[PDB]
Amino acid sequence: DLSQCDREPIHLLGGIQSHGVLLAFRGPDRLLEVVSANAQALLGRPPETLLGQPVGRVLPAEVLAQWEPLVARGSVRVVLPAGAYRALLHESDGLTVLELEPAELQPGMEETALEVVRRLVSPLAGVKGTQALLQTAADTVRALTGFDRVMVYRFDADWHGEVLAESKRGGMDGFLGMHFPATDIPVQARALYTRNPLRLIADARARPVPLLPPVVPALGRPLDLSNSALRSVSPVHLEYLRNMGVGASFSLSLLKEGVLWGLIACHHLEPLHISHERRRACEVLTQLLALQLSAEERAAEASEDAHRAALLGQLATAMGEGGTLEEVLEKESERVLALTGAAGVALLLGEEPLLVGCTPAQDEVEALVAWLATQPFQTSFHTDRLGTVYPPLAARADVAAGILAVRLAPAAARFAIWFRPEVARTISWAGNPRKPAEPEPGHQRLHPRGSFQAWEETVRDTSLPWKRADLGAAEGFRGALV
């Protein structure tokens, strides 16, 4: 892809986080083939001496005693001399990968998790606004994790994001309302986070633990850690966290109708480990937030659609109360404009355009119609930034930043064209977006930016976006005009 940021193979860095141990076994005899360099933390022997040994000569008796539930369930609690660990199995590169990390210490964790689930599944949840839904999600994740700061981050259409909601303990700074470049979470990270929806960085200053040997011998590259809970993340991102002053990080993918919509991101000022089962409990909260957001958005669409049909019916009542079409459309100007949330409309019904509300002048409308008659758009054309495609109205964002045009005739230049002004938007970037990274001379090592201080820009010349309900209303009104 575009950036050098996009090229780092984050699933092939060959490192795990220091609080866990990884062992990968090969074949029907379960021979140890890859092992983390710290594995004496649970094995007792130098890990290199155990490569090639079958699982029964490698793992502690306590783990072997749980082998059947581990294999059949993929996850089991094991009590080791170091304490309670969660053992996790997955498959990668033709190997069975066993990961061990400290297990949840609170027996009541799941009881607590169900209580916070009740907040997000509550009878009629989000009846205060979808902002209230986002805030409850941040608050419940903060309550369940104990992280200092929890943020709801939504990706915009160009893959840059903004913090929509924040929950944090007193005295903490935050990022509420701030925008971050698309390169802060590059394309291969977004792809990984669509498939693996959770990631914990327990200690942002800890050094990674390498795997032994550094390649899977059959493949000649490091073991694929895509599905590994212990994977050590990109060094550039660890520097980014350090530049933010963050000691530990935990994020969850928000997958809404199958696409990566955003993240819940959590920051702690000191190292902090969250158990596997507690991370999975937080995942339930994020899935519930996605479902609540979907329910509310679809309900909003249904309500908007009903309003559009009601307007079409009110306009039909007004027609045939007497008078010509032009008289009725002028008398019912507010209803005609409300069909598409517009500030003006031009109707080309055979003669000069009938201008209702705020439109460009007759000459400019006539020129736009002659241009529209050449473009290929079936029945409807819409844009929220007319000036980028139609330079004659680029300076007229006061009345024509966006248009929605519908055809009223197969070949003839007969149209209804609704108009919208620009909506200026002042946004605060977390750091200068013109300098989204600090590469070294030669552009070969790359570092994150050092500053996240607010940097203000105002976006101009773009209207509110045309909504699905606006487009349907316009198609429905074509029949009254044809």
Contact footprint for ligand EL5 (CB under 6 A) = 3-5, 8, 10, 151, 153, 161, 163, 175, 180, 183-186, 189, 199, 201, 233-234, 236-237, 240, 249, 251, 263, 265, 267, 437, 446, 448
| End-to-end Cα spacing for the chain | 47
For its own copies, the binding residues in 281-340 under the rule CB under 8 A are: 281, 284, 287-288, 291-292, 294-295, 298-299, 301-302, 305-306, 308-310, 312-313, 315-317, 319-321
CB nearest ligand EL5: which residue? Answer: 5
Tokens of 37: 């360099």
Site for its own copies in 397-426 (CB under 8 A): 407-410
Residue 390 CB coordination number (10 Å): 18
Q: Which residues contact 471 (CB under 8 A, 6 or more apart)?
A: 380, 382, 404
Cα 25 to Cα 57, 245, 295, 387, distances in angstroms = 12, 38, 44, 60
Nearer to its own copies, 273 or 280 (CB): 280
CA 274 to chain CA centroid, nearest Å: 22
With CB cut-offs between 5 and 8 Å by kind, which of ligand EL5, its own copies, none does residue 453 bind? none
- Smallest distance, Å, CB 179 to ligand EL5? 9
What is the C-alpha separation between 187 and 260, in angstroms, rounded? 12
If phi > 0 it is left, if psi is from -120 to 50 it is alpha, else beta; for residue 245 that is left
State the Cα–Cα distance between residues 207 and 18, nearest whole angstrom.
Answer: 7
Non-local CB neighbours of 49 within 8 Å, separated by 6+ positions: none
Q: Which amino acid is at 89?
A: L
Q: Is 111 in the site for its own copies (CB under 8 A)?
A: yes
Task: By CB under 8 A, name the one of 118, 128, 221, 460 that touches its own copies.
Answer: 118
Nearer to its own copies, 48 or 321 (CB): 321
Q: Which three-class secondary structure state does DSSP give residue 72?
A: helix
In order, the DSSP letters of 422-481 are: ---EEEEEES-TTS-B-PPTTSSS--B-S---EEEEEE-S-PPPPPHHHHHHHHHHHHHH
Nearer to its own copies, 209 or 315 (CB): 315
Q: Which of 362, 375, 379, 453 binds its own copies (CB under 8 A)?
A: 379
Residue 35 or residue 408: which is nearer to its own copies going by CB?
408
- Minimum distance, C-beta of residue 289 to ligand EL5, in the bound complex (Å): 16
Residue 104 DSSP SS3: coil
Which of the listed partners (ligand EL5, its own copies, none) does 468 bind, with a CB threshold of 5 to 8 Å by partner kind?
A: its own copies
The count of residues interacting with its own copies (CB under 8 A) is: 61
Partner from ligand EL5, its own copies, none contacting 168, C-beta within 5 to 8 A by type: none
Residue 122 sits in the site that holds its own copies (CB under 8 A):
yes
Cα–Cα dist 155/174, whole Å: 18
Tell me which of ligand EL5, its own copies, none is bound by residue 472, counting a contact when its beta carbon lies within the kind-specific cut-off of 5 to 8 angstroms.
its own copies
Q: Which is nearer to ligand EL5, 237 or 407 (CB)?
A: 237
CB of 236 to ligand EL5, least distance (A): 5
Separation CA 260–CA 159 (nearest Å): 10
105 three-state secondary structure: coil
Shortest reach from residue 215's CB to its own copies, in Å? 33
Say which entry of its own copies, ligand EL5, none residue 479 contacts (CB below 5 to 8 A, set by partner kind): its own copies
Q: Based on C-alpha coordinates, what's the Rg of the chain?
A: 29
Cα distance between residue 236 and residue 244, in whole Å: 12
What is the per-residue DSSP string for 140-192? HHHHHH--SEEEEEEE-TTS-EEEEEEEE-TT----TTEEE-GGGS-HHHHHH
Least distance to its own copies from the beta carbon of 394, Å? 30
Query: 């986080």: which residue's tokens?
Result: 17
Nearer to ligand EL5 by Cβ, of 33 and 162: the residue is: 162
Is 123 a binding residue for its own copies by CB under 8 A? The answer is yes
Instruction: Choose the contact partner of 176 out of its own copies, ligand EL5, none; CB within 5 to 8 A by kind.
Output: none
Q: How far is the CB of 288 from ligand EL5 (least distance, A)?
A: 20
**Residue 256: strand pairing partners:** 259
Nearer to ligand EL5, 80 or 446 (CB): 446
Question: In this complex, which beta carbon is closest to its own copies, that of residue 16 or of residue 290?
Answer: 290
What are 210's strand-pairing partners? 15
Indicate which of ligand EL5, its own copies, none lies near residue 117 (CB less than 5 to 8 Å, by partner kind). Answer: its own copies
Q: Between 63 and 263, whose beta carbon lies closer to ligand EL5?
A: 263
Residue 157 interacts with which of ligand EL5, its own copies, none, CB < 5 to 8 Å by class: none
DSSP 379-397: TEEEES-HHHH-GGGTT-H
Distance in Å, CB of 169 to its own copies, minimum: 22
Do residues 413 and 369 touch, judged by C-beta distance below 8 A?
A: yes
Tokens matching residue 468: 């699905």
**Under 8 Å CB-to-CB from 389, ≥6 apart: which residues?**
383
Interacting residue ranges for its own copies, rule: CB under 8 A: 107-108, 110-111, 113-114, 117-118, 121-125, 255, 257-258, 277, 280-281, 284, 287-288, 291-292, 294-295, 298-299, 301-302, 305-306, 308-310, 312-313, 315-317, 319-321, 379-380, 407-410, 468, 471-473, 475-482
